[PDB]
Design a protein around this motif. Structure first.
Motif, PDB file in Angstrom:
ATOM      1  N   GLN A   1      -4.838   4.753  -7.028  1.00  0.00           N
ATOM      2  CA  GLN A   1      -3.791   4.580  -6.036  1.00  0.00           C
ATOM      3  C   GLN A   1      -4.306   4.821  -4.615  1.00  0.00           C
ATOM      4  OE1 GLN A   1      -1.590   3.124  -7.191  1.00  0.00           O
ATOM      5  NE2 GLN A   1      -1.002   3.757  -9.263  1.00  0.00           N
ATOM      6  N   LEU A   2      -5.070   5.887  -4.420  1.00  0.00           N
ATOM      7  CA  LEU A   2      -5.595   6.174  -3.092  1.00  0.00           C
ATOM      8  C   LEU A   2      -6.315   4.959  -2.519  1.00  0.00           C
ATOM      9  CD1 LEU A   2      -6.197   7.819  -0.695  1.00  0.00           C
ATOM     10  CD2 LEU A   2      -8.204   8.785  -1.860  1.00  0.00           C
TER      11      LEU A   2
ATOM     12  N   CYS B   1      -8.955  10.134 -12.473  1.00  0.00           N
ATOM     13  CA  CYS B   1      -9.533   8.813 -12.331  1.00  0.00           C
ATOM     14  C   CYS B   1      -8.510   7.707 -12.069  1.00  0.00           C
ATOM     15  CB  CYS B   1     -10.358   8.456 -13.580  1.00  0.00           C
ATOM     16  SG  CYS B   1     -11.382   6.957 -13.465  1.00  0.00           S
ATOM     17  N   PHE B   2      -7.309   7.781 -12.648  1.00  0.00           N
ATOM     18  CA  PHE B   2      -6.312   6.708 -12.463  1.00  0.00           C
ATOM     19  C   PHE B   2      -5.158   6.905 -11.487  1.00  0.00           C
ATOM     20  CE2 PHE B   2      -7.080   3.123 -15.539  1.00  0.00           C
ATOM     21  CZ  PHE B   2      -8.384   3.527 -15.835  1.00  0.00           C
ATOM     22  N   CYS B   3      -4.792   8.147 -11.214  1.00  0.00           N
ATOM     23  CA  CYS B   3      -3.713   8.401 -10.292  1.00  0.00           C
ATOM     24  C   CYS B   3      -4.236   8.912  -8.954  1.00  0.00           C
ATOM     25  CB  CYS B   3      -2.746   9.402 -10.904  1.00  0.00           C
ATOM     26  SG  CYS B   3      -1.091   8.820 -11.157  1.00  0.00           S
TER      27      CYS B   3
ATOM     28  N   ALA C   1       0.827  -1.198   0.000  1.00  0.00           N
ATOM     29  CA  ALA C   1       0.000   0.000   0.000  1.00  0.00           C
ATOM     30  C   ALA C   1       0.861   1.248   0.000  1.00  0.00           C
ATOM     31  CB  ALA C   1      -0.891   0.008   1.203  1.00  0.00           C
ATOM     32  N   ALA C   2       1.775   1.331   0.946  1.00  0.00           N
ATOM     33  CA  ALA C   2       2.625   2.485   1.026  1.00  0.00           C
ATOM     34  C   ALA C   2       3.142   2.800  -0.356  1.00  0.00           C
ATOM     35  CB  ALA C   2       3.743   2.202   1.954  1.00  0.00           C
ATOM     36  N   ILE C   3       3.737   1.801  -0.990  1.00  0.00           N
ATOM     37  CA  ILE C   3       4.265   1.972  -2.324  1.00  0.00           C
ATOM     38  C   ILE C   3       3.302   2.821  -3.125  1.00  0.00           C
ATOM     39  CG2 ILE C   3       4.614   0.847  -4.503  1.00  0.00           C
ATOM     40  CD1 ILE C   3       6.033  -1.360  -3.229  1.00  0.00           C
TER      41      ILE C   3
END
Length: 417
Positions: A359-360, A353-355, A50-52
Motif C-alpha cells: 500500500q505504501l 510485506c502486503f499491508c 493513491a489516497a485510498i
C-alpha cells in the motif's frame, strides 16, 4: 441440501452476493465516474486512488484486529452496512461537490472512508461469514462461489445502466444493498449447540510481534520477495486502476466503451474459475517461485502490450490477461509463502510485506503515475511502468528463492499433510 436448507447459508450466501454488487459498480464505475461525471484529471485521480491506499493501509489492519476482540459479534459488520447504505447520497452529494466546486485534496481524504467500506470490508465480510461457515457446516468455499455471482451480474448491469443515468445505478446499488443488507441481519446466529461456548475455541487465531518481525528482517528472502510483490503489484495495480479510462478512449462512443468494460469484467470471472480449478495442480506441478514469475511476466506483457496498442478489440485482448494473472498470483503468492516460509510467519508476512509495504508504494507510485499520465500520456507513461515491471519480473527470476529449497520433498509433505 443441508447446505441449501439451513438459514444462514441461504442468508449470508446472499450477503456475499450483494456485496459484490455495490463493490461491482464501485471499482469500475469509479474511474469512469470521475471522467464523464467528474471531469477528473490525473493529479486528481492519482491522489484519489493513491489516497485510498492510505486508508487501505491504516484502516484495515485495525479493523481486522477488532474482528478478534469482536469474536463473532455482528456490531462491526453493521457499521459497514451502515456506511454502505448512504452510498448514493454520500457519493452524489459529497464527492461531486468537494471535487467539482474545485477542492480536490479534501474530497479525497474526506472521501476515502465510506470509500473504505470496500477494501477492508471485503476481507471483512469475506471473514466474518467464514467464521459463520464453521458454525453451521457449509464452507465459505461455496459461499464465495455463490457470492461471486453478484459481482458478475452487477458489472454487466452497471455499464448499461450507468451511461443511461449514472445517478441511477448508485440508487440501485446502494438500495438493494441497504434493503437486503439490513434484511439479512434480522435473521442471524448467536449461541452454540455443541460448537463450544468460547469464541476462542472453534476458529482460533494467528499472532505477530517485534521479534517475529526483527527475525523476518534478518531474513534475506523477505527482501527479495518484497521486491517482487512491492515492485510488480504496485506497478501493475497502479496500472489497472486507471487502465480503464484508457480502454475507454478506444470506442465508438463514451456510451459503448463503458458497456464493453462491463461485459469484460463480468465475462472475466468465468475465466477465473476455469483457471483456479486447475491452479493448485498447476502450481504444485510447477512450484511457487515460478507461479509468481509466469504471473508477473503476464502483467508485464499486459502493459508493454498497451504502448503498442491501437484498436479496441486489441484492448479487449489486453484486459482479459488480467484474469490470467489473478489465479496465478493469489495462488502462487500464497503457496510460495508456505513453501519457503516458517508457517509461524504467515500473519506477519502479510502485515509487513502486503499491508505496510505494498500500500505504501502505491500512495507514491500512484501519484507519480497520475502526473506521468497527464504530462506524458497514457501509452507514454506505460513504457516507464511496463518496462520497470518487466525488469523487476526478470530480476526476481534470477533472484527469487529456490523453486525447490534445501529440502522440497520434506516440506512438500508439510503442505500435503
Amino acid at each position: 441440501m443441508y447446505y441449501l436448507k439451513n438459514t444462514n447459508f441461504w442468508m449470508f450466501g446472499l450477503f456475499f452476493f450483494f456485496y459484490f454488487f455495490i463493490m461491482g459498480a464501485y471499482f469500475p464505475f469509479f474511474p469512469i465516474w470521475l471522467h464523464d461525471i467528474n471531469h477528473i484529471s490525473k493529479s486528481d485521480t492519482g491522489i484519489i486512488f493513491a489516497a485510498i491506499s492510505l486508508f487501505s493501509l491504516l484502516f484495515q489492519p485495525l479493523f481486522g484486529l477488532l474482528s478478534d476482540k469482536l469474536g463473532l459479534r455482528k456490531y462491526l459488520l453493521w457499521i459497514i452496512t451502515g456506511m454502505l447504505v448512504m452510498f448514493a447520497p454520500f457519493f452524489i452529494f459529497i464527492f461531486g461537490p468537494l471535487l467539482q466546486y474545485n477542492i480536490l485534496v479534501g474530497s479525497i481524504v474526506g472521501g476515502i472512508y465510506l470509500g473504505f467500506c470496500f477494501n477492508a470490508g471485503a476481507p471483512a465480510v469475506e471473514a466474518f461469514i467464514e467464521k459463520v461457515s464453521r458454525r453451521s457446516n457449509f464452507e465459505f468455499g461455496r459461499a464465495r462461489m455463490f457470492g461471486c455471482v453478484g459481482w458478475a451480474l452487477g458489472a454487466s448491469i452497471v455499464g448499461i445502466m450507468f451511461t443511461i443515468n449514472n445517478q441511477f445505478v448508485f440508487w440501485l446499488g446502494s438500495g438493494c444493498a441497504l434493503i437486503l443488507a439490513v434484511l439479512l441481519f434480522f435473521a442471524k446466529t448467536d449461541a452454540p449447540s455443541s460448537a463450544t461456548v468460547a469464541n476462542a475455541v472453534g476458529a482460533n487465531h494467528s499472532a505477530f510481534s517485534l521479534k517475529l518481525a526483527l527475525e523476518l528482517f534478518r531474513q534475506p528472502k523477505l527482501w527479495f520477495l518484497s521486491l517482487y510483490v512491492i515492485g510488480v503489484s504496485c506497478t501493475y495495480d497502479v496500472f489497472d486502476q486507471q487502465f480503464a479510462n484508457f480502454f475507454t478512449s478506444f470506442f465508438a462512443t463514451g456510451e459503448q466503451g463503458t458497456r464493453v468494460f462491463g461485459y469484460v469484467t463480468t465475462m472475466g470471472e468465468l475465466l477465473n474459475a476455469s483457471i483456479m480449478f486447475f491452479a493448485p495442480l498447476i502450481i504444485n506441478r510447477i512450484g511457487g517461485k515460478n507461479a509468481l514469475l509466469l504471473a508477473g511476466t503476464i502483467m508485464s506483457v499486459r502493459i508493454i502490450g498497451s504502448s503498442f496498442a491501437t484498436s479496441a478489440l486489441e484492448v479487449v485482448i489486453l484486459k482479459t490477461l488480467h484474469m490470467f494473472e489473478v489465479p496465478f498470483l493469489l495462488v502462487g503468492c500464497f503457496k510460495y509463502i508456505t513453501s519457503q516460509f516458517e508457517v509461524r510467519f504467515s500473519a506477519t508476512i502479510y502485515l509487513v510485506c502486503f499491508c505496510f509495504f505494498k500500500q505504501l508504494a502505491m500512495i507514491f507510485m500512484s501519484v507519480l503515475a497520475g502526473n506521468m499520465y497527464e504530462s506524458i500520456g497514457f501509452q507514454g507513461a506505460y513504457l516507464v511502468l511496463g518496462l520497470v515491471a518487466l525488469g523487476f519480473t526478470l530480476i526476481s527470476v534470477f533472484t527469487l528463492s529456490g523453486p525447490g529449497p534445501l529440502s522440497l520433498l520434506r516440506r512438500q509433505v508439510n503442505e500435503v499433510a
